[PDB]
Amino acid sequence: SGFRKMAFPSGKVEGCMVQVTCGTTTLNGLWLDDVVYCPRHVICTSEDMLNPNYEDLLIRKSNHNFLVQAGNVQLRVIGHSMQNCVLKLKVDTANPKTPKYKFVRIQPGQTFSVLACYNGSPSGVYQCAMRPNFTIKGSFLNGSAGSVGFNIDYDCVSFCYMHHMELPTGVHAGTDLEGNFYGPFVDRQTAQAAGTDTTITVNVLAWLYAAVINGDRWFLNRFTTTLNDFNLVAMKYNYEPLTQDHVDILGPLSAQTGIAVLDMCASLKELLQNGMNGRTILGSALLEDEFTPFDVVRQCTS
Amino acid sequence: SGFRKMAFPSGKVEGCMVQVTCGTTTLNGLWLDDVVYCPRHVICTSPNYEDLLIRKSNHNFLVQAGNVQLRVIGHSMQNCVLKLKVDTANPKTPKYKFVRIQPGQTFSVLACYNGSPSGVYQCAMRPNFTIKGSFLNGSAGSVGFNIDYDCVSFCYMHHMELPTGVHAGTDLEGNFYGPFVDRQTAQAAGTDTTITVNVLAWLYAAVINGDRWFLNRFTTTLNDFNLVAMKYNYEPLTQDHVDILGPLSAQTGIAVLDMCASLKELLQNGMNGRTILGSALLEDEFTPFDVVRQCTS
Ligand code: NA
């Protein structure tokens, strides 16, 4: 038993991380086959960081200006191109450690593993959720841009996040691997703010199921609610609406525990209206919402 | 900015994980050079281990590295772990050493099932010597480790779960952490305590990340803090702990006994419904080294 923030094994991604240096700027790149993917702000010079013209900066640059290093080996850049906010550097060597992979743009409330990287060398791995306001609560210092987020399904690495920047509140913003930012953010050092976040309701319910699986059952009761009645309460407390598909996805956890999803919604309703009253759930005094139903299933179910 | 429970990259360990089978019992093994390390209980079948090992033969041992069949050349006892010599050295063997960690120290765990890694998480050895981890059946043989400059220091191998849901295991020398044995005895973990020096490091991490509502003007003596900490089941803070917190004290400009008065206030009065680094409880699974490694800022 037990329950912990559990990331996917990072070995398949570690073999793809490279260092990309353009002038005085060094960050991380993702080397898949013969293409290196990295944030386009690597070409950004101190001359204009408020609102640079990335098309102008890319034209003022050639293949030889991009220093790409994989460990001790220098990769030769053969071509470069710009896709939205991501730079693509074609190299003469295909990464022999390229795993089976695909690019995926995830939905808010989904989680992924982040391989934090500096100078092309992985430093650590941890779990992150795509917040409803399209930020993530990561751990990133200067030089960590180009670190990627991912999920691994049947040995296929689904890349979903590339880190770009940190917002004034300390939350983090990035793009998918096609260069499209999550949220309304832009890759410029301007005064930007995320919108007000909301709690991922289906994830809280999954975490409650994980609590029951681990013998934490004090919050349960005999009451049941309708989907409509619960979603009225969820609105009052700044919780995301719960859909019928959310109920279906929680089905395996309901099977494991014996607690109907609408029964667990009644428990969550009472938790929101009364609080924990000094008690804890899975070693936490707050309702955790960064665990998806699939995360609980993969960790707490054989 | 930001502070999260971060595990070490698991790739160097992933290439050493194998599956070891004995009759109907199957668990995980660690393949370094021509030796596979596995829990001794696998030889036991649904306990005088020495006799069962004598009765056991090499062909009774089935070791699979993915789908590569490893031929067992011999088997020897390593305390509560079993060393299976195989005819092939692991080509992916990293630079490594076997290290026994102290209570309060942290490490990353690669949870594995049938020789295949499922997930990586960061755990801390408890003062009781139990580890609070996430293990299902078949996870025995999963290992805990730290990585420093591409050298893997293996410190833990998982053996079993205690009745309270906490986990017990050995180091890679087969010596069990705590008084636990790999038998069916009614062993139970001793009363656990909170790792005081880790909480202080985590408070320093919060200050570095701008979370500092808990700072106050008071400074406590070491003994006055320890008497309060004892009342709340906190481990005593030693002068060596104070010395270890020196670098974080210098970076933040907050004396250690100044921070201790903050912790004393939090213990006696609670958090008043506020959070520190996203948590409404006091966190004790981050060493001072863990803070410097991630909050370099
Ligand atoms: Na103080």
Numbering used by the authors:
A (entry chain B): 1 to 302
B (entry chain A): 1 to 46, 52 to 302
Task: Provide text from the study.
The main protease of SARS-CoV-2 (Mpro, also referred to as 3-chymotrypsin-like protease or 3CLpro) is responsible for the majority of nsp processing, cleaving at 11 conserved sites along the polyprotein including self-excision of Mpro by autolytic cleavage of its own N-terminal and C-terminal autoprocessing sites. SARS-CoV-2 Mpro is a functional homodimer of two symmetrically disposed protomers that are each 306 residues in length (33.8 kDa). The active site of Mpro features a Cys145-His41 catalytic dyad, which orchestrates nucleophilic attack at the carbonyl carbon of the invariant P1 glutamine and the formation of an acyl enzyme intermediate central to efficient peptide cleavage. Using C-terminally substituted Mpro chimeras, we have determined X-ray crystallographic structures of Mpro in complex with 10 of its 11 viral cleavage sites, bound at full occupancy intermolecularly in trans, within the active site of either the native enzyme and/or a catalytic mutant (C145A).
Cleavage site C8 has crystallized with the same approximate unit cell dimensions and relative Mpro dimer orientation in the crystal lattice as that of the earlier structure for C5; however, the C8 crystallographic data is defined by the space group P212121 with four protomer molecules in the asymmetric unit (ASU) compared to space group C2 and two molecules for C5. C4, C6 (form 1 - see below for definition) and C12 also share a general relative disposition of Mpro dimers in the crystal packing but C4 and C6 have higher symmetry belonging to space group P22121 with three molecules in the ASU with the symmetry generated dimer contributing its C-terminus to one of the active sites of the non-crystallographic dimer. Using C4 TSAVLQ as an example, the substrate adopts the same extended β-strand-like conformation as C5 SGVTFQ, with the P1-P4 backbone, in particular, superposing near perfectly and maintaining the common hydrogen bonds for P1 and P3 residues. P2(Leu) induces a distinct active site conformation in the S2 subsite with Met49 and Gln189 (and surrounding loops) changing orientation to create a deeper binding pocket in which the isobutyl side chain is buried, sandwiched between Met165 and Met49. Gln189 is more extended and forms a single hydrogen bond between side chain Oε1 and main chain NH of P2(Leu), an interaction common to all Leu/Val P2 substrates. In the canonical form 1 binding pose (C4 for example), the P3 position of substrate points outwards towards the solvent, away from the binding groove. When the cleavage site region binds in a standard extended conformation (form 1 structures), the P4 residue occupies the complementary shallow and hydrophobic S4 binding pocket (side chains of Met165, Leu167, Pro168, and Gln192) which are remarkably closely positioned in all captured structures and in part influenced by the rigid Pro168 main chain conformation which packs directly against the Leu167 side chain.
